[PDB]
Every structure is written in structure tokens, then in C-alpha cells.
Amino acid sequence: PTALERVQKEGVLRVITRNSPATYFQDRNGETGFEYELAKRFAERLGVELKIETADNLDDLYAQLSREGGPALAAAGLTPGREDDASVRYSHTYLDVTPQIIYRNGQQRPTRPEDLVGKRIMVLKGSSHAEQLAELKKQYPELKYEESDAVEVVDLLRMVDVGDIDLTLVDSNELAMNQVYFPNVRVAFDFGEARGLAWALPGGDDDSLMNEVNAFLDQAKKEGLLQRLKDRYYGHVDVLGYVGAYTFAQHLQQRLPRYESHFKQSGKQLDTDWRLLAAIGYQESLWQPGATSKTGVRGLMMLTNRTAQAMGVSNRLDPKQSIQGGSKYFVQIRSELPESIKEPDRSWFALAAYNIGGAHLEDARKMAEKEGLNPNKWLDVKKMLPRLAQKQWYAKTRYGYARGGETVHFVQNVRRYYDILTWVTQPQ
Ligand SMILES: [Cl-]
């Protein structure tokens, strides 16, 4: 009975991973993570259910994988070993990452490997990163670094952010994912060439499962799934920019605490996720209650007088009222969307209408239907929205010109800020 046959016979694919937003994360609304979604899709390919198991550290992860009755594979952003070990075999690679030395804005930036000597350094125990430093230590014997089995990457970066350690070493993708929480964290330099991440399978001569893993990852590439997952989880710096990333971190730390209870209160009484509402707040005003503009919108949630009057907001500059009014407006808009639009798209459609109004959004949907696209599918209607800004298209619509390009930007950003806030984890 082959490894694949055991999986098929048991009707379950058991996957071991790390506990973190990058790989696998549990939230009241559900389960997320780059590896989680990639493994989920693989389980569906095999016609079996996914069963996630977590490891406390990398040594434990590899120990579980090689134990009798262990999981089928490990999907945890793993870097294959410098040299082969009979205990583990790796799939083809599915994401190129660059190891980076991370330092604290305020202290001097080490520029080369030799500068790592005489520094307080911590890395994950059992990691490829620890091995890079072990290899380096042969060349510079005075190099010191600590290995912890009790920390995750988020903790290492937190330690650098607050000055508990001088430096750490992590993969570029997880740095990008975490830059939005740690305002003082900075890349010092790229330490070594880019490496491929791969899934790990148990040792031995059985290729039944391995060949399906490699066929799947090929299909995952061709369909764009790897790029789309990469962009959601590891695209914060790409999309927001580097200054935007650590600037958000600064605001998360300094601004959000003044308004968090207002968001939670509105979210609770409106029975809707408070972090989605806070994400709207950030896109609108960067959580600034005195924010204004010359386009007739004002306050933390940037309400028009029209909207403010309808929602019963008597002071747009008051943060509590602004948050409540805009939150109420968002929920009302979402409720009034045509019944044919189902979640999760319904919420993204609601953000579009929050920004551009339901009338203009209806024009975008009608255009989608004419092009033979699904008007109830957000990714289709998202293609049509920019056309409302073009006179070649808007002149024949019922409601005419609208800034649908800016609407697409608004929805993408809020969704990202919503992810970011959902993935916050508390200090140790
Ligand atoms: Cl989007």
C-alpha cells in the first residue's frame, strides 16, 4: 500500500505546518494562510479532506514527519537543506525567497556578513537560517548567534523592533508580511542567493505522493494560484510600498488604539467584523478624525454631508460618530445589494458601492453582463469599473462618468488592510 494509497484509502490528507499567518492561521471567520490554501487545493485535487496539524518548531515538524503514523507532508515555507538527509525529501520549489538580515532603524546598518560579528542575534532553531550562520561562523569564529525553539518569525522581528536583540535573519516574503506590524524593522542586506521553498515528504523510495505533489504545483503555477496567494500573503510591500508598509505599522501602533473601541462597538452592534470597518477607516483617513478634503468629504470615515445626514451623524469630525455613521452606511449598502450577489463577493461589492455609490456600481454590473461576464462575480465586475472613467464607455450608461479606477484601488487596499488587521498576533 503506497503513501498515496494510504491517503486515498483514509480519505484524509494530513499536512503539518507552522502556526502563523504566513502558513496557517485560525480566526473566528475561518482558516487562512499561503500553505493552508495551497494544501487545501491539493487535497481537493486528490478528492480527500485536509487535516491540518501544527508543530511547535522546525525540529518538531521534521520529527513528526518522520515518525510512524506521521502526516503525509509538511507545508511550512521550508527551505531544502544545504545537503541531503535520508529522513526527508523535498518537492519541486514553488516560491523564490531571499534570506535577509533584519536590523533596527536607529542603530547602524550592518552591510556585509563580517559585520554580524559582535551583535546580539537570534534565529529560529533548526532553520536554514541558523545553518547559514553556522557556515558563516567557520569563516568568522567570533560570530555569536542564539537559536530559540520557543519563538516564531513574528517574535524575532518583534525583538528587533523593540531592541531586545540587534539582528535576526528571515526569508524576504515573511519580512514583507510582517513589516506592517513593526515600524522600526528594516532590511540590512540580502544574505545569500535566492532559494526555493518546497514541501517536505517522509524519506524512502515511495514516489506515489511526491509525483502528485509536483504535478499539482506545476498546475498551481499555470493557473496563477501561486502568484495570487503570493500577492495576498506576501505582497504587502509590493502593493503598499516600503514606506507605506512601515508607516502603516507606525499608525497601527500610535493611531488605532485611540479608535479601536469605537470600531469594536460599532462592529458589535452592527453584527459585522470590526477590522473590516477599521480597514475602511485607514483607507479613508489613515485613522485621522480631523481629516478633510476639497471634494466634500470629511472625518475619519470621510463622509459626505449627504451620507452623514442620512446616517444621523451630527458631527463628521467626531471619531465615534464618523466611525458609527460610515459603518452603518457600509452595512446598509451591503444589505441593499441585489440578492443574487453572494458572500464573499457581496462584501467586496459593498466596498465598491461605499466608495462609488450603488447607482454607478449597477452600471458596472450591466456592462459586465453585456460582455458576457458574471455580474455577481466581483473579479469580473472589477474589470468593468475603470470604464466608468472613460467617455467612450460612460456616455451611453444610465449614470455616466464615475472614478471607477479609484474604486478598484479602494477595494483592493481595504481588503489588504482587513487581512493585515485580521492577522495581528499578540506579544509573548
Ligand atoms: Cl479586490
From Swiss-Prot:
The active site is at 284. GO terms for cellular component: cell outer membrane. This is Membrane-bound lytic murein transglycosylase F. One of its GO terms (molecular function) is peptidoglycan lytic transglycosylase activity. Murein-degrading enzyme that degrades murein glycan strands and insoluble, high-molecular weight murein sacculi, with the concomitant formation of a 1,6-anhydromuramoyl product. Lytic transglycosylases (LTs) play an integral role in the metabolism of the peptidoglycan (PG) sacculus. Their lytic action creates space within the PG sacculus to allow for its expansion as well as for the insertion of various structures such as secretion systems and flagella. SMART domains: PBPb (SM00062). The gene is mltF. Disulfide bonds: none annotated. SUPFAM superfamilies: Lysozyme-like, Periplasmic binding protein-like II. It is an enzyme of class 4 (lyase).
